[PDB]
Structure formats: C-alpha cells, structure tokens
Amino acid sequence: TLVKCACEPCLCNVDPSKAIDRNGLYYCSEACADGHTGGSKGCGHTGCNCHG
Ligand SMILES: [Zn+2]
Ligand SMILES: [Zn+2]
Ligand SMILES: [Zn+2]
Ligand SMILES: [Zn+2]
C-alpha cells in the first residue's frame, strides 16, 4: 500500500521503505524534506504544486 507524503498539498504517493524518511515522516523529494525553502514549487516530478 502507498502512503502520503508529509506535504499536505503534495499529491504524491510514496513508500516509507524507499522515501527520504527522517523520523517516521516520509518525504518524496529533498524539496518536501527542506520544505520548498525560499523558492516556488513542488517536488521535481510532474505538476505537484506543493509548498512547505
Ligand atoms: Zn509535491
Ligand atoms: Zn512530497
Ligand atoms: Zn512538498
Ligand atoms: Zn512529490
């Protein structure tokens, strides 16, 4: 089963065995783990406009 990503507006479905999981919290890309600091969009894959 896939689990969500830790960004509420992130529509990505990742797994906690492959994702960049820090401490129980799954991040799809580095961008959701940094929290989209400063600049604009998303997680490096298509059309996800998630902020942090
Ligand atoms: Zn995203
Ligand atoms: Zn994400
Ligand atoms: Zn994100
Ligand atoms: Zn993503």
Query: For domain 1-52, is the CATH number 2.40.30.10?
Result: no
Method: NMR
**Of 47, 6, 49, 50, which Cα lies nearest the Cα of 28?**
6
Q: How many angstroms separate the first and last alpha carbons of the chain?
A: 25
- The CA distance from 40 to 24, in Å, is 26
Angstrom distance (rounded) from CA 29 to CA 36: 10
**Helix/strand/coil percent split, the chain, to 5:** 10, 10, 80
Span from the CA of 17 to the centroid of ligand 3 (angstroms): 18
Going by the annotation, the residues of the binding site are 5, 7, 10, 12, 28, 32, 36, 43, 45, 48, 50
DSSP code, position 49: -
Q: Judge contact between 13 and 2, C-beta under 8 A.
A: yes
Q: How far apart are the C-alpha atoms of 50 and 48, rounded to whole Å?
A: 6
Nearest alpha carbon to residue 14 among 31, 1, 24:
1
